[PDB]
RNA sequence: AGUCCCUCCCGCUCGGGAGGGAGGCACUCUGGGGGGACUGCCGGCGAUAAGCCGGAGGAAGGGGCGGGCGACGGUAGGUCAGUAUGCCCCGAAACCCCCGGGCUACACGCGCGCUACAAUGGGCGGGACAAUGGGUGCCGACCCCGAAAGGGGGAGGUAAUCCCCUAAACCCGCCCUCAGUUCGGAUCGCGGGCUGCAACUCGCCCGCGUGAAGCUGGAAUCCCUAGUACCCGCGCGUCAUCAUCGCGC
């Protein structure tokens, strides 16, 4: 109902139709799967050290080249 | 009308507009914590020296961000509440004095109506109006589809501020309400998660659409 | 205390109120029917605008003398709305300013420097500075920082 | 008892040469000379359409002509007055002498 | 002289004012005092429009 | 009898400031600084004085002559001149360090100027252009 | 005292408006002329129109009959140097309308250029007619 | 700016201001010469090269920022109606002058714009701060007359000296309170002026009166990355008079 914070640890690359989406690796900070590292797609400027609020932590983005 | 003590006001401490302190304001959201600048500062006017550098807007006081956000016309090339709002010559663009006065009066109204520190109410409003999930578009067979993605904190802050400004602009358009009153009303409504707030309803709709397309 | 120590508009208001006691200052007979310049649209709304204009002219002469009719005409001009055409700047008329200056001279507040314009006499300087001092004495009760000046 | 000299030219170097000659003439004698004062430069700017016809995108030329000026004051002494009266200026330098 | 001003002593006469290609007759009436002669000799013919031609609209080109 | 002169520039506005021992009176073109309007312009000038402290403020007198530019450009030049005069008069590096943290431009100035206009709708700006049509 | 409707010179005036703006309902009286007549009559232009008395209305109508005789300048009337009598007159309501109609009819009788332009319903003061002044329906090719 | 002298104001003068004369080149400015930034220093990636990414110090940091200069050619692109020029035509008219008309017409389609559809306002009184340019067939301060537009004299200026030249958006106080209105100002009537040899066709300005459509705009589609875009006025060109334009500030 409030989501789970995750911390960005690595930048992979740009993607999307018009280069608007970035793929990152994040580490869960709270919840059932705290400590796991998964990759995600993010819209907007982002840098290492930012914190995202995920609404669910079971979907993983498909790897890009 | 306005008393002489207010027309010629002399400050003596470094605090926002010489009237309010941000010592006890706290940001609950961990993600927006490093992007809401609350350092002590008297005059919120940095003369646009931050836009040059990447991530430069991070270290700009939040009140000046609001002032810049409302310094606009409002409805140029898309409709807000079903209307174009093209102010043109009568628009507030490039008049930072009038926007400063509007924000000051709105803060006075907010403090009078609730009895709390206005900066705290503003922080609560932007916290409640910032979405957490968005979508991006793909094209297949001549049809447009949505795919759910996540939002970075800085974009969340930008969207929250823009939606608050747009709601305030829409409330005072061709009605008897004034701009300052509309801004105060919008902030108060957004702080209480009231659906009558434009920003809160917009956030709810965005998150619903994002959820229905995972 | 001098004229430089007080806001202009408050001083103009006080001087306009005080000027009604001088017998030599009287609005002309065509005063109730005219506008204050070609760039205006409607007649003045105050029933005693003549005294306000005269006080403003006196304070203007105090600060920028010597000065003549044309530069004052430039000062009292403004922007005009021209229907379907873009707005433009225009000067004001001459009769009001000339009559006001002649009345002020008859009152002994200004004098004429040949080929240069009009300047403020010692009597007029004292008249303005006394009112300025009174206004500053009233004003600093609510703004304590003015006691230093 | 003082003479005022005005110089103007479109070439900076010739102006400097004439000024230096006057300065040396004043130095070789006991006579006080107020230094060469540089006055603001005259700029003549003319903007014209390029094409002879009216077809195509509109482009413009900006031609410019610059005129430099100097001012010198010196006290009227006949021993030095004759020397400066006999100096020969280049054809692109204008000189004017007056007594004040 | 299309720019001659009508005077009271001219009332009662008839004058032929050039209009570009011909002289048209004008009978001077008392109420014409103060007007130029050319006001009574029109130079253009009244317009009666025909059918729009090819190129008059976007689709007709 | 110390007298110190300083200069400030901001987009065609030029300010010259003179500082000496005094009682705390500051004048801008002869007007007391407490009467400057509008408020947003008044606070621009007052920030260096508030940062310095009340003890330093009440021990000096400052007179500023400023010309050129607009009502907002003139205030900033006066602010720059006052900051430089303050750091030079007291000559302590704690205050100089504090100014740089709060606002660097107080001491280094602002080099921005307008960009000259270009053809194709010259009167509007160097980059704004006429609307383009195809039919 | 207060009356919500006051009739002056055959026109009903609002009683809740200021007198200077209430008087503008009369055809032939603008805001400036109304202020002039209010000042000549010795009445505050900002008073409510509903506080007028009968004598004041009579005085106002009398002033409206012959303004020049009551101190209004000759250059402020709407018909100076009348074409028939040669005097300076001010007209309102029907008389104004029939005076304008008579002027246009006089222009038409002598077959002057402006008379023809009035007859044909075309611009009179020298405007261009190729682009603007279009009032009709599109014709097809 | 500091220093000296004289005169005048204020809380009566301890103190605080404004002019004028001496005097000075400090500060601003003007314009000649010179210095300063080089991937030079530090840490990574790449190859240990070429380079790239990130920091210190600095007025300025990675073509420092904005302009001028457009290769061999093509486009049978535009211009013989700027001037130069071959051929063909007219050569007592298709050459040269003068008078009056037209290029300004008006069921209609289209381009670029200005003014608005109001409170992020309209009106009235008062208070603030520029730059670029131009002036002898000319710019004209200062005085007088007039309600305004304008009129009669006229210092100084061939100009860092005199003049155009005390910008508007902005701020303070009062009236109007969501209405086709105190929004909008098209159209038309009467009257007064300027330039010019001449103002009807066919000029520009002022006073009073009158008061049209318009209540935010479908499908479509344009400009812009920092002192940039938006908003606000000003200067020059054209020019006897006339700017909703061009080039600049
Ligand atoms: Mg004004
Ligand atoms: Mg307008
Ligand atoms: Mg610009
Ligand atoms: Mg071809
Ligand atoms: Mg044509
Ligand atoms: Mg209106
Ligand atoms: Mg005509
Ligand atoms: Mg409406």
UniProtKB/Swiss-Prot annotation, chain B:
Gene: rps7
Keywords linked to the UniProt accession: Ribonucleoprotein, Ribosomal protein, RNA-binding, rRNA-binding
Source organism per UniProt: Pyrococcus abyssi (strain GE5 / Orsay)
SUPFAM superfamilies in alphabetical order: Ribosomal protein S7 (SSF47973)
Quaternary context: Part of the 30S ribosomal subunit.
Superkingdom in the source lineage: Archaea
Presence of the UniProt keyword Cell inner membrane in the record: no
Record-annotated membrane-spanning stretches: none
Function comment: One of the primary rRNA binding proteins, it binds directly to 16S rRNA where it nucleates assembly of the head domain of the 30S subunit. Is located at the subunit interface close to the decoding center.
GO annotation terms (biological process): translation
Gene Ontology CC, one term: small ribosomal subunit
PANTHER family: RIBOSOMAL PROTEIN S7
This protein's name: Small ribosomal subunit protein uS7
Pfam families tied to this protein: Ribosomal_S7
Molecular function per GO: rRNA binding; structural constituent of ribosome
Family: Belongs to the universal ribosomal protein uS7 family.
Swiss-Prot record, chain C:
Record text on subunit structure and interactions: Part of the 30S ribosomal subunit.
Gene Ontology annotations for the cellular component aspect, listed alphabetically: cytosolic small ribosomal subunit
SUPFAM superfamilies assigned: Winged helix' DNA-binding domain
Gene Ontology terms, MF aspect: RNA binding; structural constituent of ribosome
The keyword Ribonucleoprotein appears for this protein: yes
Organism the protein comes from: Pyrococcus abyssi (strain GE5 / Orsay)
GO aspect biological process, one term: translation
Family: Belongs to the eukaryotic ribosomal protein eS19 family.
Keyword Ribonucleoprotein on entry: yes
Keyword field: Ribonucleoprotein, Ribosomal protein
Record gene name: rps19e
Protein name as it appears in the record: Small ribosomal subunit protein eS19
Stated role: May be involved in maturation of the 30S ribosomal subunit.
InterPro entries: Ribosomal_eS19, Ribosomal_eS19_archaeal, Ribosomal_eS19_CS, WH-like_DNA-bd_sf, WH_DNA-bd_sf
UniProtKB/Swiss-Prot annotation, chain E:
Taxonomy, superkingdom: Archaea
Family: Belongs to the universal ribosomal protein uS19 family.
Functional description taken from the UniProt entry: Protein S19 forms a complex with S13 that binds strongly to the 16S ribosomal RNA.
Protein name, UniProt field: Small ribosomal subunit protein uS19
The species this protein was found in: Pyrococcus abyssi (strain GE5 / Orsay)
UniProt gene name: rps19
Range within the parent protein: 67 to 127 of 132
Swiss-Prot record, chain G:
InterPro entries: Rbsml_uS13_C, Ribosomal_uS13, Ribosomal_uS13-like_H2TH, Ribosomal_uS13_archaeal, Ribosomal_uS13_CS
Single GO molecular function: rRNA binding
Annotated Gene Ontology cellular component terms: cytosol; small ribosomal subunit
UniProt KW keywords: Ribonucleoprotein, Ribosomal protein, RNA-binding, rRNA-binding
GO biological process: translation
Cross-referenced PANTHER family: 30S RIBOSOMAL PROTEIN S13/40S RIBOSOMAL PROTEIN S18, SMALL RIBOSOMAL SUBUNIT PROTEIN US13
NCBIfam families from the UniProt entry: PRK04053.1 (NF003140), uS13_arch (TIGR03629)
UniProt subunit comment: Part of the 30S ribosomal subunit. Forms a loose heterodimer with protein S19. Forms two bridges to the 50S subunit in the 70S ribosome.
HAMAP family documented for this protein: Ribosomal_uS13 (MF_01315)
Family of the protein in this entry: Belongs to the universal ribosomal protein uS13 family.
Function, in words: Located at the top of the head of the 30S subunit, it contacts several helices of the 16S rRNA. In the 70S ribosome it contacts the 23S rRNA (bridge B1a) and protein L5 of the 50S subunit (bridge B1b), connecting the 2 subunits; these bridges are implicated in subunit movement.
Name this polypeptide is given: Small ribosomal subunit protein uS13
Name of encoding gene: rps13
